[PDB]
Subunit: 128 residues, 4 copies
């Protein structure tokens, strides 16, 4: 991956991992997300994500977003961040997410959306 | 569109419009977004989005997220909401977004992410 | 209340009401908040809030924030918005909130914070 | 400060410092905040904050919120977090904030609110 391609494997401050396949000339990509965390009474399932990374001004440190479609859940998480190359040539994904729960009724909407951050750095795509 | 398919045209409280093409059996879709608003010294450009709508428990009022990849900008917006069918059979998208700006340096990250909501309802896909 | 003083009674899109007493020359105020909504297995209790409204450039449409300290809950909500005087001289509070739940352990922190908006307009402080 | 009183001095991942005076039996406190960061063409000014920490169930790891009223700015920041005592007896404030800018018109509201996190740990209140 070119410095800051989202392509490859990544881990975050929560221990969550994600895999992002090749990014086409449209900035689009899909991948999978394995969350290390849930408030779920359900088996965590590696879940597909789908996104785009920015390709306006073809910036070395592009911003991006993607949706993760939980397999084990009725919710969705969207993440948006920027890929930064730090002082040591190390790629850092700085992200924020909205985690959308499925609420019963439009009147429960006010409580459906959680927010937070994640910081992702690169994992070896090659195992021992 | 089946009650609550995200497929079709939609408008939001900002006057922004979006078009969402067919949703495959994976919950995936692409579309375009025309924002009625920017803080941009640049021509607003109808911009592509890409997402997934939830299809766990095949719920009549599914949650969803998608990324919009601004053509006129270095930023990304991700939206996540739920499709609700209101008391009158009317589809309401209740959404929250994170709008990610491109900041110069990882140290500017703290200020890169704006948040807000949008409410979307359906526009006629057939013009006069 | 001078056009846009937060002082007085207000209601929001959720049916929630709040009372804000006089704002001192520091921009500070306290008040009470009665939420029309909870996900709580507990009696909703009118709860105290405490805040400040902005008083830099003494702007007619000042921004502000305050904390509500739920009496019936271990959580806190903070709201921040701006007071706008609309096209018809009508005061509109546009706000966003972070609702902080109390989670058991620092490792549960990622899921503790909900976000959303509220829109508040003025209620008669004088009853029939 | 009792393990998890917000009272004392704190620093955050941004280098920002804050001082929080005694917390009364109402959970209320005031203090000052010196941000290490701005997007401001203005002298950063140590700015007052005002808040409450939770005191329902008198939990060792209480949640809390407070408003900072920027002296050098038309904006407000509200923070809400939880005070956690980590595996080593060390107090960690985990927080999220909404930083509210002052926008010109109610129609600019959608872009006024930034969000992010801060992590605060304790500084010596006693200098060398
Ligand atoms: C994320 O990926 C990492 C690396 O592939 C996983 O961590 C490894 O876990 C195995 C056990 O399954 C250990 O033998 C290795 O020592 C670990 N390596 C590293 C670098 O930590 C981790 O389990 C994955 N986390 C997920 C899938 O949530
Ligand atoms: C969103 O779509 C609506 C409907 O297609 C557009 O509103 C129409 O705008 C035309 C002028 O271009 C008028 O003649 C119609 O009377 C309007 N119809 C309605 C139902 O409002 C609107 O311009 C589009 N907004 C965008 C693209 O931002
Ligand atoms: C918010 O305040 C309003 C007005 O004081 C309350 O609405 C009134 O409720 C009473 C019954 O308690 C009715 O008789 C009135 O007709 C209502 N007036 C209006 C203007 O709606 C409302 O109950 C309060 N909501 C709270 C406390 O959550
Ligand atoms: C936050 O407070 C810390 C500690 O009081 C400040 O860091 C000290 O800065 C002085 C110079 O002003 C140095 O001589 C010390 O070595 C630093 N000590 C530590 C522990 O870092 C810091 O300047 C303050 N930051 C603000 C006010 O933004």
């Amino acid at each position: 991956a070119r410095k800051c391609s989202l392509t490859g494997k990544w881990t975050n401050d929560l221990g969550s991992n994600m895999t992002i396949g090749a990014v086409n000339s449209k900035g689009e990509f899909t991948g999978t997300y394995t969350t290390a965390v849930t408030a779920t009474s359900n088996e965590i399932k590696e879940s597909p994500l789908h996104g785009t990374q920015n390709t306006i001004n073809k910036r070395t440190q592009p911003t991006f977003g993607f949706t993760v479609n939980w397999k084990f859940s009725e919710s969705t998480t969207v993440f948006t961040g920027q890929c930064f190359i730090d002082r040591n040539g190390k790629e850092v994904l700085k992200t924020m997410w909205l985690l959308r729960s499925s609420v019963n009724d439009i009147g429960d909407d006010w409580k459906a959306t959680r927010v937070g951050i994640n910081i992702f750095t690169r994992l070896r795509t090659q195992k021992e």
